[PDB]
Design an enzyme around this catalytic site. Structure first.
Site, mmCIF file in Angstrom:
data_model
loop_
_atom_site.group_PDB
_atom_site.id
_atom_site.type_symbol
_atom_site.label_atom_id
_atom_site.label_comp_id
_atom_site.label_asym_id
_atom_site.label_seq_id
_atom_site.Cartn_x
_atom_site.Cartn_y
_atom_site.Cartn_z
ATOM 1 N N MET G 37 0.823 -1.204 0.000
ATOM 2 C CA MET G 37 0.000 0.000 0.000
ATOM 3 C C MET G 37 0.859 1.256 0.000
ATOM 4 O O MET G 37 0.666 2.151 -0.828
ATOM 5 C CB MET G 37 -0.934 0.012 1.212
ATOM 6 C CG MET G 37 -1.710 -1.267 1.451
ATOM 7 S SD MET G 37 -3.284 -1.312 0.584
ATOM 8 C CE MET G 37 -3.132 -2.883 -0.252
ATOM 9 N N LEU G 42 -0.616 0.449 -4.038
ATOM 10 C CA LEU G 42 -1.694 -0.424 -4.478
ATOM 11 C C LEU G 42 -2.839 -0.339 -3.481
ATOM 12 O O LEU G 42 -2.611 -0.186 -2.278
ATOM 13 C CB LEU G 42 -1.212 -1.869 -4.599
ATOM 14 C CG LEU G 42 -0.018 -2.103 -5.517
ATOM 15 C CD1 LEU G 42 0.580 -3.465 -5.267
ATOM 16 C CD2 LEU G 42 -0.423 -1.961 -6.962
ATOM 17 N N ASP G 43 -4.072 -0.431 -3.975
ATOM 18 C CA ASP G 43 -5.222 -0.364 -3.090
ATOM 19 C C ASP G 43 -5.521 -1.743 -2.508
ATOM 20 O O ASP G 43 -4.781 -2.707 -2.709
ATOM 21 C CB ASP G 43 -6.434 0.215 -3.818
ATOM 22 C CG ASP G 43 -6.876 -0.615 -5.003
ATOM 23 O OD1 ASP G 43 -7.632 -0.084 -5.839
ATOM 24 O OD2 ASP G 43 -6.473 -1.785 -5.116
ATOM 25 N N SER G 44 -6.625 -1.836 -1.769
ATOM 26 C CA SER G 44 -6.983 -3.096 -1.132
ATOM 27 C C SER G 44 -7.499 -4.118 -2.133
ATOM 28 O O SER G 44 -7.255 -5.316 -1.964
ATOM 29 C CB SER G 44 -8.021 -2.843 -0.052
ATOM 30 O OG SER G 44 -9.068 -2.069 -0.581
ATOM 31 N N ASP G 46 -6.384 -4.556 -5.053
ATOM 32 C CA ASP G 46 -5.194 -5.150 -5.650
ATOM 33 C C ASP G 46 -4.617 -6.232 -4.755
ATOM 34 O O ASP G 46 -4.185 -7.281 -5.239
ATOM 35 C CB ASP G 46 -4.147 -4.073 -5.916
ATOM 36 C CG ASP G 46 -4.590 -3.077 -6.956
ATOM 37 O OD1 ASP G 46 -5.447 -3.424 -7.790
ATOM 38 O OD2 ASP G 46 -4.076 -1.944 -6.945
#
Ligand SMILES: CCCCCCCCCCCCCCCCCC(=O)OC[C@H](COP(=O)([O-])OCC(O)COP(=O)([O-])OC[C@@H](COC(=O)CCCCCCCCCCCCCCCCC)OC(=O)CCCCCCCCCCCCCCCCC)OC(=O)CCCCCCCCCCCCCCCCC
Ligand SMILES: CCCCCCCCCCCCCCCCCC(=O)OC[C@H](COP(=O)([O-])OCC(O)COP(=O)([O-])OC[C@@H](COC(=O)CCCCCCCCCCCCCCCCC)OC(=O)CCCCCCCCCCCCCCCCC)OC(=O)CCCCCCCCCCCCCCCCC
Ligand SMILES: CCCCCCCCCCCCCCCCCC(=O)OC[C@H](COP(=O)([O-])OCC[N+](C)(C)C)OC(=O)CCCCCCCCCCCCCCCCC
Ligand SMILES: CCCCCCCCCCCCCCCCCC(=O)OC[C@H](COP(=O)(O)OCCN)OC(=O)CCCCCCCCCCCCCCCCC
Ligand SMILES: CCCCCCCCCCCCCCCCCC(=O)OC[C@H](COP(=O)(O)OCCN)OC(=O)CCCCCCCCCCCCCCCCC
Ligand SMILES: CCCCCCCCCCCCO[C@@H]1O[C@H](CO)[C@@H](O[C@H]2O[C@H](CO)[C@@H](O)[C@H](O)[C@H]2O)[C@H](O)[C@H]1O
Ligand SMILES: CCCCCCCCCCCCO[C@@H]1O[C@H](CO)[C@@H](O[C@H]2O[C@H](CO)[C@@H](O)[C@H](O)[C@H]2O)[C@H](O)[C@H]1O
Ligand SMILES: CCCCCCCCCCCCO[C@@H]1O[C@H](CO)[C@@H](O[C@H]2O[C@H](CO)[C@@H](O)[C@H](O)[C@H]2O)[C@H](O)[C@H]1O
Ligand SMILES: CCCCCCCCCCCCO[C@@H]1O[C@H](CO)[C@@H](O[C@H]2O[C@H](CO)[C@@H](O)[C@H](O)[C@H]2O)[C@H](O)[C@H]1O
Lengths: 63, 178, 170, 55, 99, 459, 88, 126, 55, 56, 55
Positions: G37, G42-44, G46
């Site tokens: 993150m 990257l988001d959750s 991902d």
């Protein structure tokens, strides 16, 4: 578990094998009686109505 | 399996679990990797279009409708990894996962066949016995005042201390025991 | 051996054989090897055993029981007479069981022997099994776990009285 | 799955025993040669038992 | 509370005597109890009792009865008599009621 | 019989005059030798039953029951040693004397030639049985178990006493042989119908008949192991043995008098076998299993056919060995974790592989796997009942299905699944314990080899 | 059976291998300690796919409760090593 | 569409309206439940990992369950019209039904035997 | 059945009856006046039975 | 032999002596029941040359 | 008995090589990577479906 199985086998064979040899030896060298008509005037003993030598021997000596 | 669950799942946790299920059941329908990759991207786009919903009450309603949609489009026979709950190899080796305390009943003739293993085992037993009292004290010390409690356990704070309640984790049978 | 009259067996009728093909019959050669490797040593062991038996020849006899008065000739309450009559009836009942077993044994042997012809060539064994079964049922059917000479006699008299009634009406 | 196999085959075994009791009472035998003389009889009860056992 | 003993603790029987057979805490008493059970129970009773039963002759006159049956089947057939008759008792020995 | 009874009586001084360290080795060894001598009763070369004197006899019904009784005494002694090892020396000797007393009383009971002698010995057995249950049972419910056991028996036994006196006043004797030969048809009066029930109820309560069986699950759960062994193996068979002896004089009323007891047994065997599916206590499960099996014995004695009596005799012996084995198997786990809850210990095949084999054979015996004598008895009972009425097979069929279900259920629950690994006190099986299991199971296999010895009176 | 036992270095190589084939990660700035993150942005959503790709790679499932905490490649390597009893 | 629950096919949690409730009353219950579970888990584990434990771990919940299903039954039984009617029907009902099945069947079988139309051909064992 | 109604109707009703009969007959005041009154009833009853049964 | 040994092993004659005595009492039971020896219908016969009784 | 035992053997050959994987959705391309097992699998399937002159 293995000690128990060893002991159980030892104590079955301790007398079991000699009895198996003895039965085999009796059946080879003695054999079973052959059926014969009762001779006239003859009263057989009770153990003469059985075939096997072991059974006649037990019948004769204990019954 | 290693971490205990919380009292409740946050809204984010519930959404991410539906996302993983949705993809996995899509994979079961598609089978082929190229087809699955195509529809996996279409699936992500549907979760993205509502990613920034700030209503909450609408977000919760969007979660409801997706879960209802999942149940209708569920694969009847989804793929399960062989070692996972419901898989073909699940618990296949449990009959071989003999606990370590069984060795305390081994005969001396049995132990004499592994003289080195049973010397190391004594060291692990001595280590266990010495650490227990400190472990109990640490858990007693670290109890919170308000009754709210969880299943998470603390680490070893000091030096030479082992983390409390470690024996059943550290010495557990291997996954493939024999 | 056994009595060919009690346990009759038809004479065998085995064909020639008349082989057509030129291939060798493996069963013929396996039997010759079997008769040498297996049959011959076994016979020598048996002949040795039979030689030992003849040196220790003993005999046994089939027991004979003289008839005693039937239950019909016993005064009721005469336990000494009832006992001997009842023991005689149990001996006969047992011998009847073995006669049934002999007749069923003939029936089973004949069915196997006749194969696809059993529905025609087993007529005599099937009729004897039918007759001997009728006679068995008349003596012993429905006597119960406490079967005895007294109950058998009561069953016979009940049947005789019914036969007499039917004949008298004729 | 192991107990499931026992259960279904035990439900079938009822039919096997039905045939056995029937043949010992009507033919006085469990031997196949003597059972062959049941050819002319009505064998619905015992044949229904074998069929259930087979099922 | 009243005066009462605490419950005794669990004991591992093999800790002191790892050759324990289950019979006694004394090792020598233990092994001889084991031997007596195996000798008298198995070597004597089960082997010789089995042998003695096996050689009981003509048990309940089953061998005589088959031998007697073959004699009668032989006799009843050469002479043309029925193998088995319906009436166990000769009807001449019975006096039925007049009615 | 005196050459069997007198050595049995000499076990009492042998117990009390032995040294504390020799008592168990002494009494067990001679108890085995007395079992050997009882085999003389099997030397039966004719069809005349053995009448040794005016007082003692033996025929093909009592002979198997006498030998099984003689065999159980050594087995009960081995079963008792471990849980008595904390009792002082006099208490151990007192317990052994109670076990010998039952052996003496039961051998005399099965060889008695006269019915009031049978009754006195039949009633005498309650005393040592009650003492064993209540003095050496573990729980507070052992006292209630003693009351139920004693008074279920006694209330039925008093009518039996009246009937026996009544028969003797009318006939002049209670000798069994003379009653057999001189029996005459009964009239179907109300008075004779009450006579039938007075003659039958005590034996039916003892079996036990379904409806009056509540004493037996109570008695087993609370008794010590040697009490459970004798109760399930031999004491229940006093009722079946009593019914077979006395029913010879009750004809022809048994033709209609039996209907309520056939119905209770054939329906009851389904109720008690189905209880075993939802029983949390392993001892109780085995006990209810016995009630289901003895229901079959009741039904086959009630219909009084040659097959039904032979199937009942085999099942009596087969159940005797099988149920005693199951109690011993259950007691071996209880002696380790001290609970009878079936679902508590689990996956035990992991740690007791040979004991699990004994478990499997006992279970296979119990669900009547062919060609075991267990199956042979149940099969011939099924054939006789089908002849009695073809619709009996429906209830037989249901019981066979249920019996497999609970028999395998007990094995799966306790031996398989994951090991309950918090139980670090699961000590390896004792040589004594494994020997005890074999002494049950070898005779079952040997009797399967030579089933002529337990066919009873009718075949 | 015929598969070799896993190793700590072998697991690490295949964990980084899978991540190098993810277009939303530049291979050069990826290390074992790269937080998905923070460092990698990257988001959750991902992170769900990264775990799903890890399960496919090694052929075993990671429960959701445990998967949500794996935020760097070293956490993934450690998790796989403790599941499969890898120790060297 | 729509899933209809049944007693043997229950409602999934994801479709359960009570799983999506976030009111502080519910969240306080959920936190309270976990506190009970966590305390029970701690007590169990302290016994489980204790190196001086020599015996298995006593399980008071299991003892209560087995007690509730045996000894506690009769003291808590009350004869009611529903108990009494159910007891009489279950206890005696099957007995009466099976009496008429066997009695009717056996009466017919005897009726045929007396008047000769029961085919007893080879039946010699019973 | 087994835990409730078979208990209630056979062993438990027998226990209740004899306990009830036990408390009704053993709850005596220990007053000699009351016992002597009851003995008077016994005497009268015996005289009445003798009178009616007088031929 | 030795009072310590004999005081321990003398009990080994009890059950064997019960068996021998039990056998003796069973033969005494035979003697009281000879009222039909060689007198039954089934078995009675003429005595052999030097035979006093058909069974004892 | 012939082609069915072979089919199970060949699937056990595949299951073993793919690390105890039984789902066909994670197989594929077995005709090239396991030539011997695939050839026997096809032989067994053609015998099952009634291909002429096979068993
Ligand atoms: C060239 C020369 C070189 C030759 C090359 C070698 C060739 C080898 C030949 C091999 C064949 C050998 C056959 C042989 O000699 O054995 C015969 C030998 C003599 O017997 P037989 O004359 O053939 O017939 C026996 C009678 O019918 C009476 O039978 P029985 O009742 O007395 O005993 C049988 C019984 C066994 O006896 C028992 O039942 C008692 C069991 C109690 C056992 C307790 C111990 C535990 O079986 C029960 O099922 O058989 C035995 O004695 C074997 C006894 C063991 C039984 C095994 C089953
Ligand atoms: O008055 C005396 C009696 C009177 O003669 P009798 O009046 O003409 O006989 C007709 C009467 O009706 C029958 O005579 P009775 O009415 O006077 O009844 C007495 C007779 C009644 O006899 C019976 O028939 C009763 C049958 C009981 C069932 C036995 C089952 C088989 C026993 C096998 C034993 C294993 C043998 C290996 C040793 O009992 C005996 O005389 C002794 C028989 C043996 C019983 C004791 C067995 C236990 C000791 C063996 C086990 C010890 C092992 C542990 C050793 C190591 C310790 C650390 O004479 C005898 O004692 C027998 C005659 C002498 C024959 C000597 C034969 C050589 C010795 C063989 C010893 C092995 C015995 C094998 C017996 C197997 C078949 C029973
Ligand atoms: C468990 C079951 C165990 C089975 C054991 C079987 C053993 C069989 C023993 C018999 C051995 C016989 C060998 C033999 O043939 O010669 C014996 C030999 C006999 O020799 P022979 O058998 O070769 O004699 C040949 C045939 N005549 C004599 C007619 C020419 O026995 C002797 O030792 C001599 C005395 C005779
Ligand atoms: C399966 C493998 C076989 C293992 C046993 C082999 C031993 C043996 O030889 O037995 C064979 C013999 C069969 O003889 P038979 O009954 O006559 O056969 C029918 C006609 N051929 O069978 C026998 O005669 C042996 C019969 C067993 C005798 C039992 C020995 C003592 C039992 C101890 C008491 C415990 C039992 C208590 C209940 C007994 C009830 C009588
Ligand atoms: C007239 C009488 C005729 C019958 C006589 C039968 C023989 C009786 C003597 C048998 C016992 C021999 C002496 C003895 O006590 O056995 C010793 C044994 C071990 O005792 P322990 O104190 O530990 O000494 C250690 C020695 N190494 O302790 C034991 O375990 C011995 C077990 C004895 C069991 C009973 C023996 C029965 C013998 C068959 C009876 C035959 C009739
Ligand atoms: C339960 C355990 C049982 C243990 C069994 C032990 C039994 C021992 C068997 C002994 C059998 C041999 O027994 C012996 O056989 C001989 C055969 O020569 C027979 O002897 C008889 O016939 C022979 C035939 O030649 C004559 O020569 C002889 O004079 C005559 O007595 C008898 O039967 C017995 O004397
Ligand atoms: C298979 C076996 C069959 C078992 C029996 C099946 C039939 C069961 C039904 C029995 C019906 C009679 O049911 C009856 O109900 C009443 C209702 O109060 C119970 O009565 C209960 O309360 C009353 C007060 O009013 C008390 O006096 C009584 O002692 C108490 O039991 C009876 O005790 C019970 O006997
Ligand atoms: C027709 C043939 C069958 C007839 C058989 C009749 C059997 C009769 C047995 C009577 C039993 C006596 O049982 C005696 O009373 C009851 C039985 O409920 C038991 O009582 C038990 O349960 C009650 C509740 O019901 C508890 O309150 C009590 O604390 C407990 O002891 C007694 O502890 C026991 O001493
Ligand atoms: C013809 C006679 C046939 C019946 C045989 C006799 C059986 C005995 C029945 C009467 C005695 C049993 O009595 C029955 O059980 C016990 C007494 O033991 C009593 O129960 C009582 O037990 C104890 C002692 O008082 C108390 O702690 C308990 O709380 C209370 O329930 C029951 O309330 C009573 O009903």
């Amino acid at each position: 578990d293995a000690r128990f199985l060893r002991l159980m086998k030892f104590y079955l064979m301790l007398t079991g094998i000699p009895v198996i040899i003895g039965i085999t030896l009796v059946n080879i060298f003695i054999g079973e009686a052959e059926l014969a008509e009762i001779p006239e005037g003859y009263i057989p003993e009770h153990w003469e109505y059985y075939k096997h030598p072991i059974s006649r021997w037990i019948a004769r000596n204990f019954y | 399996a290693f971490c205990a669950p919380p009292a409740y799942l946050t809204h984010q946790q519930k959404v991410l679990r539906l996302y993983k299920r949705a993809l996995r059941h899509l994979e079961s329908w598609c089978i082929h990797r190229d087809k699955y990759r195509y529809f996996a991207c279409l699936m992500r786009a549907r979760f993205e279009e509502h990613k920034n919903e700030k209503d909450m009450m609408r977000a919760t309603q969007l979660l409801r409708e997706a879960e209802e949609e999942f149940w209708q489009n569920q694969h009847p026979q989804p793929y399960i990894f062989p070692d996972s709950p419901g898989g073909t190899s699940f618990e296949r080796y449990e009959c071989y996962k003999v606990p370590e305390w069984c060795l305390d009943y081994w005969h001396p003739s049995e132990k004499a066949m592994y003289p080195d293993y049973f010397s190391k085992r004594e060291q692990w037993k001595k280590l266990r016995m010495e650490s227990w009292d400190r472990e109990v004290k640490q858990l007693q010390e670290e109890t919170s005042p308000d009754g709210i409690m969880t299943e998470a356990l603390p680490p070893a704070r000091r030096e030479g201390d082992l983390p409390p309640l470690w024996w059943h984790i550290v010495t557990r049978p291997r996954e493939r025991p024999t | 051996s056994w009595d060919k009259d009690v346990y009759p067996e038809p004479p065998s009728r085995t064909p020639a054989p008349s082989p057509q093909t030129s291939l060798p019959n493996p069963i013929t050669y396996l039997t010759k090897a079997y008769d040498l490797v297996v049959d011959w040593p076994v016979t020598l062991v048996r002949e040795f055993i039979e030689r030992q038996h003849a040196k220790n020849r003993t005999y046994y006899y089939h027991r004979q029981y003289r008839r005693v008065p039937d239950i019909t000739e016993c005064k009721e309450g005469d336990v000494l007479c009832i006992y001997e009559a009842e023991m005689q009836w149990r001996r006969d009942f047992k011998v009847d069981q073995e006669i049934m077993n002999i007749i069923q044994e003939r029936l089973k042997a004949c069915q196997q022997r006749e194969g696809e012809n059993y529905q025609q060539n087993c007529a005599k064994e099937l009729e004897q099994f039918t007759k001997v079964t009728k006679a068995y049922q008349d003596r012993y059917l429905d006597l119960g776990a406490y079967y005895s000479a007294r109950k058998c006699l009561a069953k016979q008299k009940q049947r005789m009285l019914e036969e007499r009634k039917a004949a008298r009406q004729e | 799955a192991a107990l499931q196999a026992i259960l279904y085959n035990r439900i079938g075994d009822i039919g096997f025993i039905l045939a056995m009791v029937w043949f010992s009472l009507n033919m006085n035998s469990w031997e196949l040669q003597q059972i062959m003389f049941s050819n002319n009889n009505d064998n619905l009860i015992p044949l229904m038992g074998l069929l259930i056992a087979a099922t | 509370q009243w005066q009462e003993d605490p419950e005794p603790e669990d004991e591992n029987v093999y800790a002191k005597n790892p050759d324990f057979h289950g019979y006694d805490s004394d090792p020598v008493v233990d092994v001889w109890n084991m031997r007596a059970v195996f000798f008298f129970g198995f070597s004597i009773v089960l082997v010789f009792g089995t042998t003695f039963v096996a050689y009981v002759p003509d048990y309940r006159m089953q061998e005589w009865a088959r031998r007697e049956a073959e004699r009668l089947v032989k006799y009843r057939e050469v002479n043309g008599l029925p193998i088995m008759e319906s009436n166990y008792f000769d009807p001449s020995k019975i006096q039925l009621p007049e009615d | 019989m005196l050459k069997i009874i007198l050595p049995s009586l000499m076990l009492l001084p042998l117990t009390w005059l032995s040294s504390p360290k020799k008592t168990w080795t002494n009494v067990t060894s001679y108890s085995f030798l007395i079992s050997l001598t009882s085999l003389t009763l099997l030397w039966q070369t004719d069809e005349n039953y053995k009448n040794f004197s005016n007082m003692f006899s033996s025929d093909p019904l009592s002979t198997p029951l006498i030998i099984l009784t003689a065999w159980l005494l050594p087995l009960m002694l081995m079963a008792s040693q471990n849980h008595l090892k904390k009792d002082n020396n006099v208490l151990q000797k007192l317990y052994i004397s109670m076990l010998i007393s039952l052996q003496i009383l039961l051998i005399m009971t099965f060889s008695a030639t006269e019915l009031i002698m049978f009754y006195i010995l039949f009633e005498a057995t309650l005393i040592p049985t009650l003492i064993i249950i209540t003095r050496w049972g573990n729980q507070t419910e052992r006292l209630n178990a003693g009351i139920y056991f004693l008074f279920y028996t006694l209330i039925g036994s008093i009518p039996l006493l009246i009937a026996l006196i009544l028969i003797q006043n009318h006939v002049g004797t209670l000798n069994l042989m003379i009653l057999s030969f001189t029996t005459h048809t009964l009239d179907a009066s109300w008075s004779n119908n009450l006579l039938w029930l007075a003659c039958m109820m005590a034996f039916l309560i003892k079996m036990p008949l379904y409806g009056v069986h509540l004493w037996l699950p109570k008695a087993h759960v609370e008794a010590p192991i040697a009490g459970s062994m004798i109760l399930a193996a031999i004491l229940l068979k006093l009722g079946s043995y009593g019914m077979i002896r006395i029913s010879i004089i009750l004809d022809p009323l048994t033709k209609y008098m039996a209907y309520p007891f056939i119905l209770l047994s054939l329906w009851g065997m389904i109720m008690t076998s189905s209880i075993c599916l939802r029983q949390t206590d392993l001892k109780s499960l085995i006990a209810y299993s016995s009630v289901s099996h003895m229901a079959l014995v009741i039904a086959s004695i009630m219909i009084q056919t040659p097959w039904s009596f032979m199937g009942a005799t085999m099942l009596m012996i087969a159940h005797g060995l099988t149920s005693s084995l199951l109690f011993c198997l259950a007691n071996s786990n209880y002696e380790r974790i001290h609970s009878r809850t079936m679902i508590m210990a689990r996956g035990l095949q992991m740690v007791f592989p040979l004991m699990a084999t004994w478990w499997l054979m006992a279970s296979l015996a119990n669900l009547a796997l062919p060609p075991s004598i267990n199956l042979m008895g149940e099969l011939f009972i099924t054939m006789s009942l089908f002849s009695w009425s073809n619709f009996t097979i429906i209830l037989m069929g249901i019981n066979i299905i249920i019996t497999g279900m609970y028999s395998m259920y007990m094995i799966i629950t306790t031996q398989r699944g994951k090991l309950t690994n918090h139980m670090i006190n699961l000590q390896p099986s004792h040589t004594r314990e494994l020997t005890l299991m074999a002494l049950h199971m070898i005779p079952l296999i040997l009797l399967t080899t030579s089933p002529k010895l337990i066919t009873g009176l009718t075949m | 059976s015929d598969a070799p036992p896993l190793t700590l270095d072998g697991i690490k190589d295949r964990v980084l291998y899978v991540l190098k084939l993810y277009d939303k990660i530049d291979p050069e700035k990826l290390s074992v300690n790269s937080h998905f993150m923070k460092d990698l942005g990257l988001d959750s959503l991902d992170q769900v796919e990264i775990i799903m790709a890890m399960e496919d790679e090694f052929g075993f499932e990671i429960p959701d409760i445990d998967a949500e905490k794996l935020m760097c490649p070293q956490e993934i390597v450690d998790y796989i090593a403790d599941k499969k009893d890898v120790y060297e | 569409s729509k899933y209809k629950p049944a007693p043997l096919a229950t409602l999934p949690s994801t479709l359960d309206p009570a799983e999506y409730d976030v009111s502080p009353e519910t969240r306080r219950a959920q936190v309270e439940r976990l506190s009970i579970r966590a305390r029970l888990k701690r007590e169990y584990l302290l016994q489980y990992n204790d190196p001086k434990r020599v015996s298995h771990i006593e399980d008071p919940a299991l003892i209560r369950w087995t007690y509730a299903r045996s000894a506690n039954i009769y003291p808590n039984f009350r004869p009611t019209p529903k108990n009494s009617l159910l007891g009489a029907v279950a206890g005696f009902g099957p007995l009466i039904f099976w009496y008429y099945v066997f009695k009717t069947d056996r009466d017919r079988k005897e009726r045929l035997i007396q008047e000769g139309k029961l085919d007893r051909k080879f039946n010699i064992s019973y | 059945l087994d835990l409730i109604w078979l208990e209630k109707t056979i062993p438990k009703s027998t226990s209740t009856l004899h306990t009830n009969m036990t408390t009704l007959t053993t709850n005596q005041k220990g007053l000699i006046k009351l016992y002597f009154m009851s003995f008077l009833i016994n005497i009268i009853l015996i005289i009445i039975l003798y009178s009616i049964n007088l031929e | 032999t030795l009072f310590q040994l004999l005081r321990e092993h003398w009990v080994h004659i009890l059950v064997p002596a019960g068996f021998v005595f039990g056998c003796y009492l069973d033969r005494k039971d035979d003697e009281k029941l000879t009222a039909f020896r060689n007198k039954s219908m089934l078995f009675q016969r003429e005595l052999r040359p030097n035979e006093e009784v058909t069974w004892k | 008995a012939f082609f069915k035992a072979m089919l199970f053997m060949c699937s056990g050959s595949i299951i073993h090589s793919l690390a105890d994987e039984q789902d066909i959705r994670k197989m594929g391309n077995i005709t090239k990577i396991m030539p011997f097992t695939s050839s026997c699998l096809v032989i067994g399937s053609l015998a099952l479906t009634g291909m002429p002159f096979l068993t």
